[PDB]
Design a protein around this ligand. Structure first.
Ligand SMILES: CCCCCCCCCCCCCCCCCC(=O)OC[C@H](COP(=O)([O-])OCC(O)COP(=O)([O-])OC[C@@H](COC(=O)CCCCCCCCCCCCCCCCC)OC(=O)CCCCCCCCCCCCCCCCC)OC(=O)CCCCCCCCCCCCCCCCC
Ligand SMILES: CCCCCCCCCCCCCCCCCC(=O)OC[C@H](COP(=O)([O-])OCC(O)COP(=O)([O-])OC[C@@H](COC(=O)CCCCCCCCCCCCCCCCC)OC(=O)CCCCCCCCCCCCCCCCC)OC(=O)CCCCCCCCCCCCCCCCC
Ligand SMILES: CCCCCCCCCCCCCCCCCC(=O)OC[C@H](COP(=O)([O-])OCC(O)COP(=O)([O-])OC[C@@H](COC(=O)CCCCCCCCCCCCCCCCC)OC(=O)CCCCCCCCCCCCCCCCC)OC(=O)CCCCCCCCCCCCCCCCC
Ligand SMILES: CCCCCCCCCCCCCCCCCC(=O)OC[C@H](COP(=O)([O-])OCC(O)COP(=O)([O-])OC[C@@H](COC(=O)CCCCCCCCCCCCCCCCC)OC(=O)CCCCCCCCCCCCCCCCC)OC(=O)CCCCCCCCCCCCCCCCC
Ligand SMILES: CCCCCCCCCCCCCCCCCC(=O)OC[C@H](COP(=O)([O-])OCC(O)COP(=O)([O-])OC[C@@H](COC(=O)CCCCCCCCCCCCCCCCC)OC(=O)CCCCCCCCCCCCCCCCC)OC(=O)CCCCCCCCCCCCCCCCC
Ligand SMILES: COC1=C(OC)C(=O)C(C/C=C(\C)CC/C=C(\C)CC/C=C(\C)CC/C=C(\C)CC/C=C(\C)CC/C=C(/C)CC/C=C(\C)CCC=C(C)C)=C(C)C1=O
Ligand SMILES: CCCCCCCC/C=C\CCCCCCCC(=O)OC[C@H](COP(=O)(O)OCCN)OC(=O)CCCCCCC/C=C\CCCCCCCC
Lengths: 148, 55, 200, 91, 74, 96, 77, 123, 50, 140, 231, 55, 68
């Protein structure tokens, strides 16, 4: 009975709430839905979602340590494939029309546009460092709290 | 309800079984203190505190 | 249907006892009583009613007559054990259906699993340490007491706290990573040289 | 209607030829086991052919080109020169 | 015992394919399994037989050396 | 015969990398994790489909017949339905 | 109420009997048993509130063609 | 009842019905090929054969303790520590040319105080 | 220890060869007989003390 | 009912005649004993392990169909079929590769099945009677 | 019975019951030629003909397995149209869909034909099963008619025609034999007839509140041990 | 019912407290085995068995 | 908003238990104590509880023996 069993209720409405966000028009939900599952074991450590994997290896956080690398590589490739999709005009999609007749001058302005294209991405991983540093600071205080 | 006295026996039989079998049980209790405090204080709001506090 | 009777008997068990075939021995409900339910007193009243209808409300007959236990409940603990052994997941599933209608959050479910497995992991380490003490015993060191919670002047090691902080810094020793040195394979050079000397 | 089998009032010969829904499932599974004879047989045939290429590769891996030893005798490491001399002093 | 288990586990995969032959063969959503299942099986067989074959060769090289070297010392 | 078949070796893999024995552990876990996630997503479309196809109709709109409802009406009718139609026809269209 | 009793006697408060028989079996049935996946002679319940459509006249001809008077009606129409 | 009788036949050999609890007991014939592939290891002989008598100075023999400190070889390959999971992807596996010994530490050492094994818990 | 779950008493007959000279099918022949005598000791006791 | 149960019947055909016809109705105790060990269709003879496989086989197979049924990464490169902008096309063959790797789940289960165990320390403990040894036993 | 009480059930950020253009931040915006250098878009004007060719393929490729059954081809045609008329009759404003409903539905139908080309579409297998169950029952009637025997369906038609005469032979005060009376006469015959059949229990509860399953065997215990096969 | 999570914490806290305080808990388990068997096998009939056996 | 009426409910019950533990325990267990078990069961509870406390005291004493 999907209307009395809270286990299928929670999972059904949760999935519907996740797939309905395809209207946000990020990209094919059929493609990136698998990465969400991996990213969930990175940030789900805060909620102990990795508990059922404690006997599957000698490292309880194995799946979380791999997912953070997966999360980094495929997020690092999302901008690269986007430029491949733009084609040879990819620099016009970023910066627009040039200003000077010198191609060497624009070459330098176009490089900055391509770096910024990636810095908007790579710079957001400093946020993840703050979450870990703050998470460690709490584990240090609780693990060293007074007990006698 | 019809076998409370009987189930209570076998319930304690296995507790004694585990306790008589587990000789380093004190080492397990002490090893469990830190995670018991850490996880309960971290997940309290998202489970119980939310029903009387910020959100 | 056609295969209904043959199949239904194949899926489930019936009660073979004929305890209730005997009339006078039938229980009125005073053998296994519910004590805390909100209809407690309504149950006792029906027991009193059944005891009166059986004696035309002359309960002196019941006092002089023989009182019997509930023969239908005989060997019930054994019968549940055999069903648990036959299909433990089905016995557990249906015995916990009403309890599993109320499903706690993902956080609570993850804590049950994590703490339960973490407890089993430490129990597995305690077993391995007991084998270390047996080898130590056989090697010529008698052991007073037991465990590794040294009461005296020794260093203890409590076990990896099951929190991400320590699970990122530490990991348990995998015995499969302790290997024979590959230099062992260099002794095969003797064989290749002998085969050529003997003309093979 | 009333001739339907009953597990209690059943004859020995009838139980031997019951052929109920349980067997009907099995007969469907058997239809797949038979139809997979060529697919499974092709795999085993390749294992038998691949077996002979492995025999020559093992000898190539152990004995090498001229019977003096192959890559089986090679062992590589990621340790630096400092790490190696640290382990020696550790010994 | 290791070579027999891995052989029985590989046989279990062939049963899983046979037990599910109609789905793997006719359903196009499982084409990738139909196409690459035998490639993975051969590589698995190769690992099994490679290990067994190498073990067998080393055992014979060892047996023939102890017998030859024993006579020289006599 | 080529050296490419050397990749099938696990007896002496500790001489080159000793990495295969550890990476497949993650791969087996990653498959198990996705099996639980994807199986839940694809399976749990039935409660919505079962509900909408039985409660989403309204009297201020026309409910149009689907493919399945066409085949069931024309090629899966029972005996009583066949009888009721001809019973109505013979009485009203023929016998008035 | 929220105070129904002990945990062991919790499955006792569920049964509601339609007769005056004592003692009463406690177990309250959750679902209907469905051991054999039988094809039901029953017609599908999707054919419930579907407005008039093309399938109505196509089936009428099939049933009318089963009679001599119906074959005349269809051909003329 | 039948399965209860069959389980009795097995438990005469298996002993304990619960898993991860104990081991079975099988008496086997004594032949020259018992432990034939481990005759080269010395510690296996001492553990199987010798039951040492503890003395008043209750300690393991010094000789046994000294041999036990000679560190064993532990593989560098490690995916359980995330720093090595990243670093070892950029590591270059170079050939370790045999120097004529059987103890070349081309990997890390199984000692708690080794600079490449201090993260491992030895208990 | 053959009735304990995950026993750590490795020195109490766990790592020793322990045979006997009793009837085999222990749980079907010997162990029930110990319970049969148990039921006699307690039934004879109840009837006496009561 | 299955073929293995029918095989038992032909072998136990005379035994069934002695229990069900003679003992099961003679009198007294011989009746209770013959009616208890009667021979016929198995009551609760279902095998949950068989069913457990059938359920998990079907559930895991439905996952294989989803993970293996993906749009190609190669076809999306030309921008001419069904895919112009696919910023996560390089994730198309991750789940398929993950399912094909699942075929080695049981072939490579445990440490002994991933390497030559006699060159590993846990093998020494098994041959020593599951007994703890010093970590350097493989060298001495 | 029960009606949804929430008046805002069909409200969305885009409007009432809007399932064609949900509100999202990255909304469509126009493009100007004089300022646009290059563009990457997949939209085109080929959906109309793809909608036509898709219908012809799905029809012609499914008829391969109908074996010339004319009645099945016509029934299948009516079902195929019901699948293509969805955008023409739906409440959803298919003309106002976010990025072109025409291209969306065409691509969705193409995925169906892909399965039809392999003869693996559930509607195909559903059609074969439904038809075989129908022909088996029509052949059972044909074999009974060739033998001069009367079909179960004719026995009711004849038994119902006489029951109507008995009712209208006494209905002389009035003379309006409504369709309602004719109906409840047949149902009284169907219930009686259906109950006569040995059918599996369909309703959860029988005349009593108790369930009609094989599991609803409670106390008192009166059944002995099960008996074995007879020789 | 409003504090099941919180009371669960303090319950396990005092269990760990007692377990961390009791170093020879194994000695207490083994010393309790005999009285557990004796008193339950002796009082079973007068508590539970009487309802299905003899009287 | 949350149920701000349940705020600080754990602290409040703790202070009531400290103020009058016997009254707090009595009324919180009244409906449960309506069903009283037999003299045998009540005695087993007390006997096993007091016996467990007696062994706990001996283990405390044995620790002072190990410290000496
Ligand atoms: C350690 C290294 C780390 C680096 C990692 C980087 C990895 C990057 C991976 C990305 C993928 C790369 C693969 C490229 C696939 C290309 C396939 C292809 O060929 O399709 C063509 C395709 C173009 O097709 P289109 O755009 O769809 O349409 C074309 C129009 O129709 C055309 O319209 P048109 O006809 O009007 O145009 C005219 C013409 C105009 O062309 C011109 O401009 C002319 C130029 C002058 C020519 C010389 C004239 C000489 C005149 C002589 C005169 C002689 C006079 C003689 C007189 C005679 C006297 C008698 O234009 C063209 O036709 C040429 C366009 C194609 C050029 C492709 C250039 C590719 C260079 C890549 C080289 C390196 C590849 C290494 C790969 C390694 C992989 C292992 O090429 C592309 O789309 C290029 C896109 C690539 C973008 C990638 C950007 C990724 C980011 C890279 C840098 C990131 C740095 C930050 C790092 C951060 C850490 C992560
Ligand atoms: C005159 C007193 C005789 C006392 C004899 C000594 C003690 C009993 C020995 C026999 C053991 C069986 C006991 C059955 C009677 C149960 C009486 C009972 O427990 O009281 C229930 C009774 C109220 O509970 P109830 O449920 O209404 O009673 C009805 C029955 O439950 C059930 O209601 P019912 O109507 O269905 O049953 C009526 C009752 C009628 O009983 C009589 O009429 C008595 C017949 C004359 C006496 C025969 C026994 C004489 C023993 C002397 C020889 C002893 C040799 C020992 C060694 C040497 C001794 C020097 O029982 C019988 O019908 C007996 C028939 C036996 C059937 C045998 C079938 C074959 C079975 C073969 C296997 C046997 C294995 C048994 C296992 C071992 C047994 C533990 O309490 C009272 O009567 C209070 C007043 C005191 C009564 C007088 C004292 C009699 C002993 C009771 C213990 C007093 C404790 C006082 C402190 C109270 C707590 C602070
Ligand atoms: C375009 C939009 C993006 C697209 C999104 C698409 C999403 C698709 C959804 C598809 C859903 C899949 C359907 C099947 C689900 C069934 C499995 C399940 O877990 O359901 C639980 C199900 C539903 O749970 P619920 O009770 O309804 O609560 C759900 C929500 O919490 C609601 O209840 P609440 O409101 O009370 O929760 C409040 C929330 C409040 O949370 C907050 O307010 C902020 C949270 C910030 C977290 C901070 C993270 C800090 C991390 C620090 C890391 C430090 C260490 C890192 C070390 C790394 C190495 C260096 O706090 C929570 O409790 C969160 C729940 C825990 C979530 C854990 C994962 C979090 C990461 C999410 C990744 C996706 C991000 C998407 C981006 C969204 C951006 C807006 O409940 C059950 O217990 C039944 C199943 C239980 C199975 C347990 C086994 C779990 C593991 C196996 C599961 C199967 C495979 C893995 C699936 C992935 C699971 C994580
Ligand atoms: C530049 C240098 C700076 C230096 C200074 C740095 C310091 C930074 C200060 C900034 C931090 C504070 C930020 C302001 C917070 C404002 C938030 C707010 O609006 O109030 C929320 C919060 C909400 O409470 P509520 O809404 O009224 O009702 C609570 C619920 O009903 C729940 O009550 P219930 O009855 O339902 O029971 C459940 C309750 C109680 O449940 C329990 O059972 C826990 C009991 C814990 C205490 C007992 C521990 C056991 C050991 C002792 C045994 C005692 C009992 C023994 C009995 C006798 C035994 C025989 O659970 C709680 O833990 C409630 C705590 C309040 C919620 C906060 C989230 C807590 C989650 C984490 C839990 C783990 C931490 C526990 C901390 C202790 C909390 C009391 O109210 C506050 O507590 C505000 C606290 C802020 C006080 C600030 C005072 C001035 C601070 C500066 C003074 C100088 C400090 C110098 C330090 C020097 C360095 C060390
Ligand atoms: C003239 C004729 C005789 C008249 C005598 C006068 C009688 C005056 C009565 C005065 C009443 C006093 C009222 C105030 C006390 C009420 C409070 C109370 O606790 O009652 C229980 C009361 C009622 O319990 P119940 O569930 O209604 O059951 C009532 C009966 O037990 C019934 O339960 P049942 O229906 O299930 O029957 C089954 C029965 C079945 O019993 C049997 O069938 C046979 C019993 C055979 C016993 C064999 C003993 C073998 C001994 C072997 C030991 C050898 C070692 C020796 C060591 C030597 C060293 C060399 O088994 C029991 O019931 C066990 C009950 C334990 C009784 C212990 C005393 C036994 C002998 C007493 C002899 C008194 C002379 C009577 C002479 C009559 C002769 C015909 O329990 C409560 O609920 C109140 C709270 C109790 C908390 C537990 C701690 C209480 C302890 C302190 C109590 C106050 C101070 C001490 C008072 C004396 C206590 C024993
Ligand atoms: C191929 O794609 C895939 C699937 O298909 C879709 C899957 O379903 C799945 C899921 C897989 C599963 C659900 C199966 C999981 C199975 C697991 C975990 C192990 C099962 C273990 C058991 C059932 C216990 C078996 C115990 C034993 C074998 C020990 C005792 C020995 C026994 C019983 C057999 C005796 C041994 C022999 C060598 C003799 C063999 C005897 C025969 C062949 C006789 C056969 C007789 C008949 C009548 C057929 C995967 C992973 C997959 O990759
Ligand atoms: C109310 C809001 C403001 C915040 C205040 C709340 C905290 C109030 C604290 C009340 C404490 C009163 C009882 C404490 C007495 C018992 C502890 C004690 O006595 O201290 C012991 C000891 C110090 O002893 P010594 O330094 O050796 O002094 C020896 C003197 N001769 O300190 C301790 O043991 C630490 C106290 C125990 C910590 C227990 C941790 C509990 C975890 C709390 C998390 C709650 C999660 C909720 C879910």
């Amino acid at each position: 009975n999907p209307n009395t069993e809270e286990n299928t209720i929670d999972s059904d409405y949760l999935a519907a709430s996740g797939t309905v966000e395809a209207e946000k028009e990020i990209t094919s939900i059929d493609d990136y839905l698998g990465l969400v599952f991996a990213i969930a074991y990175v940030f789900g450590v805060f909620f102990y979602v990795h508990g059922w994997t404690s006997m599957l290896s000698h490292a309880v956080l194995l799946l979380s340590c791999y997912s953070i690398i997966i999360m980094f590589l495929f997020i690092l490739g999302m901008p690269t494939l986007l430029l491949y999709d733009f084609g040879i005009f990819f620099l016009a999609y970023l910066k627009g029309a040039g200003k000077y007749i010198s191609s060497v001058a624009e070459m330098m302005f176009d490089y900055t546009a391509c770096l910024v294209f990636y810095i908007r991405i790579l710079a957001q991983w400093i946020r993840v460092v703050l979450m870990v540093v703050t998470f460690i600071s709490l584990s240090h205080y609780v693990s060293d709290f007074d007990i006698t | 309800m019809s076998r409370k006295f009987l189930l209570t026996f076998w319930g304690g039989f296995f507790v004694l079984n585990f306790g008589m079998a587990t000789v380093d049980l004190n080492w397990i209790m002490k090893s469990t203190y830190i995670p018991w405090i850490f996880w309960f204080q971290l997940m309290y709001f998202y489970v119980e505190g939310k029903n009387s506090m910020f959100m | 249907s056609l295969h209904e009777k043959m199949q239904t008997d194949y899926l489930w068990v019936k009660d073979h006892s004929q305890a209730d075939s005997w009339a006078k021995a039938r229980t009125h409900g005073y053998n296994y009583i519910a004590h805390t339910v909100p209809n407690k007193k309504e149950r006792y009243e029906m027991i009193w009613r059944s005891m009166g209808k059986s004696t035309d409300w002359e309960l002196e007959k019941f006092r002089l007559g023989k009182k019997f236990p509930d023969r239908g409940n005989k060997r019930r603990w054994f019968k549940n054990l055999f069903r648990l052994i036959k299909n433990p997941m089905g016995y557990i599933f249906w015995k916990t259906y009403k309890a599993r209608l109320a499903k706690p959050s993902l956080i609570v479910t993850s804590m049950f699993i994590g703490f339960t497995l973490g407890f089993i992991k430490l129990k597995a380490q305690s077993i391995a340490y007991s084998k270390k003490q047996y080898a130590t015993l056989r090697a010529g060191k008698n052991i007073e007491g037991s465990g590794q919670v040294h009461f005296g002047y020794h260093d203890q090691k409590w076990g990896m706290p099951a929190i991400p902080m320590f699970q990122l810094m530490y990991y348990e020793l995998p015995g499969n990573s302790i290997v024979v040195n590959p230099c062992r394979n260099q002794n095969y050079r003797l064989y290749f040289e002998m085969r050529k000397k003997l003309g093979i | 209607p009333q001739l339907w089998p009953n597990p209690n009032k059943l004859r020995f010969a009838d139980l031997y030829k019951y052929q109920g829904v349980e067997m009907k499932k099995i007969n469907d599974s058997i239809k797949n086991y038979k139809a997979a004879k060529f697919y499974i047989g092709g795999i085993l045939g390749g294992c038998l052919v691949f077996k002979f290429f492995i025999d020559a590769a093992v000898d190539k891996y152990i004995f090498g080109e001229n019977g003096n030893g192959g890559k089986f005798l090679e062992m590589q490491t990621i340790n630096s020169n400092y790490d190696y001399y640290y382990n020696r002093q550790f010994q | 015992a290791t070579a027999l288990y891995k052989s029985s586990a590989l046989a279990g995969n062939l049963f899983l394919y046979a037990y599910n032959y109609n789905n793997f063969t006719a359903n196009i959503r499982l084409r990738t399994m139909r196409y690459l299942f035998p490639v993975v099986s051969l590589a698995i067989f190769g690992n099994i037989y490679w290990d067994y074959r190498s073990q067998l060769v080393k055992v014979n090289l060892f047996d023939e050396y102890i017998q030859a070297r024993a006579q020289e010392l006599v | 015969i080529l050296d490419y078949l050397f990749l099938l070796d696990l007896n002496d893999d500790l001489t080159r990398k000793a990495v295969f024995e550890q990476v497949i552990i993650f791969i087996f876990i990653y498959c198990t994790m996705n099996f639980l996630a994807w199986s839940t997503v694809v399976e749990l479309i039935w409660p919505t489909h079962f509900f909408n196809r039985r409660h989403s109709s309204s009297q201020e709109f026309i409910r149009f017949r689907t493919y399945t409802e066409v085949l069931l009406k024309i090629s899966a009718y029972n005996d009583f339905f066949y009888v009721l139609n001809n019973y109505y026809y013979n009485q009203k269209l023929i016998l008035k | 109420t929220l105070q129904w009793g002990s945990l062991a006697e919790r499955p006792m408060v569920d049964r509601v009997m339609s007769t005056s028989t004592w003692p009463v079996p406690y177990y309250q049935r959750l679902f209907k048993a469905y051991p054999i996946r039988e094809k039901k002679d029953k017609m599908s319940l999707l054919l419930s509130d579907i407005d008039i459509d093309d399938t109505n006249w196509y089936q009428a001809k099939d049933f009318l063609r089963g009679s001599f008077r119906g074959r005349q009606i269809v051909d003329y129409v | 009842f039948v399965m209860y009788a069959f389980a009795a036949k097995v438990l005469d050999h298996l002993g304990n019905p619960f898993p991860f609890s104990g081991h079975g007991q099988i008496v086997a014939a004594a032949d020259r090929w018992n432990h034939w592939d481990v005759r080269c290891y010395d510690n296996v002989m001492k553990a199987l054969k010798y039951i040492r008598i503890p003395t008043v100075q209750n300690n393991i023999p010094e000789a046994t303790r000294w041999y036990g400190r000679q560190p064993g070889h532990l593989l560098r390959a490690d995916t359980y520590w995330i720093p090595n999971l990243v670093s070892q992807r950029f590591a270059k596996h170079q050939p370790a040319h045999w120097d004529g010994t059987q103890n070349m530490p081309i990997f890390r050492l199984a000692d708690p105080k080794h600079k490449d094994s201090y993260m491992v818990q030895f208990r | 220890n053959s009735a304990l779950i995950g026993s750590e008493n490795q020195s109490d007959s766990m790592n020793e060869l322990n045979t006997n000279f009793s009837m085999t099918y222990y749980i079907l022949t010997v162990l029930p007989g110990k319970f049969i005598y148990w039921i006699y000791e307690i039934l004879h006791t109840f009837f006496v003390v009561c | 009912m299955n073929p293995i149960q029918k095989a038992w019947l032909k072998i136990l055909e005379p035994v069934s005649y002695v229990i069900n016809e003679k003992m099961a109705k003679r009198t007294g105790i011989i009746g209770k004993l013959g009616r208890f060990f009667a021979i016929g269709p198995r009551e609760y003879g279902v095998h949950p392990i068989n069913r457990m496989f059938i359920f998990m086989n079907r559930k895991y197979m439905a996952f294989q169909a989803v993970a293996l049924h993906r749009y190609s990464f190669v076809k999306s490169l030309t921008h001419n079929g069904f895919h112009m902008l696919r910023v996560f096309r390089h994730f198309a063959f991750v789940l398929p590769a993950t399912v094909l790797a699942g075929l080695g789940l049981f072939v490579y289960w445990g440490d002994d099945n991933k390497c030559y165990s006699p060159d590993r320390f846990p093998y020494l403990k098994k041959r020593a009677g599951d007994m703890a040894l010093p970590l350097n036993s493989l060298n001495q | 019975g029960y009606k949804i009480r929430n008046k805002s059930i069909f409200w969305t950020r885009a409007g009432w019951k809007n399932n064609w253009h949900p509100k999202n931040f990255n909304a469509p915006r126009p493009s100007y030629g004089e300022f646009t250098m290059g563009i990457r878009c997949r939209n085109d004007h080929h959906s109309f003909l793809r909608y036509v060719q898709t219908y012809r393929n799905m029809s012609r490729h499914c008829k391969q397995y109908f074996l010339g059954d004319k009645q099945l081809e016509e029934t299948f045609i009516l079902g195929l149209r019901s699948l293509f008329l969805v955008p023409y009759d739906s409440q959803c404003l298919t003309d106002q869909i976010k990025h072109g409903g025409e291209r969306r539905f065409v691509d969705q139908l193409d995925r169906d034909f892909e399965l039809i080309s392999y003869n693996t579409h559930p509607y195909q297998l559903f059609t074969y099963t439904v038809r075989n169950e129908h022909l088996a029952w029509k052949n059972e009637q044909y074999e009974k008619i060739q033998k001069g025997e009367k079909t179960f369906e004719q026995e009711l038609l004849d038994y119902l025609d006489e029951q109507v005469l008995a009712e209208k032979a006494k209905l002389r005060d009035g003379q309006n034999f409504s369709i309602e009376r004719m109906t409840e006469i047949a149902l009284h015959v169907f219930r009686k007839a259906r109950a006569g059949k040995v059918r599996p229990a369909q309703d959860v509860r029988g005349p009593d509140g108790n369930v009609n399953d094989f599991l609803e065997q409670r106390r008192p215990f009166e059944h002995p041990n099960p008996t074995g096969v007879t020789h």
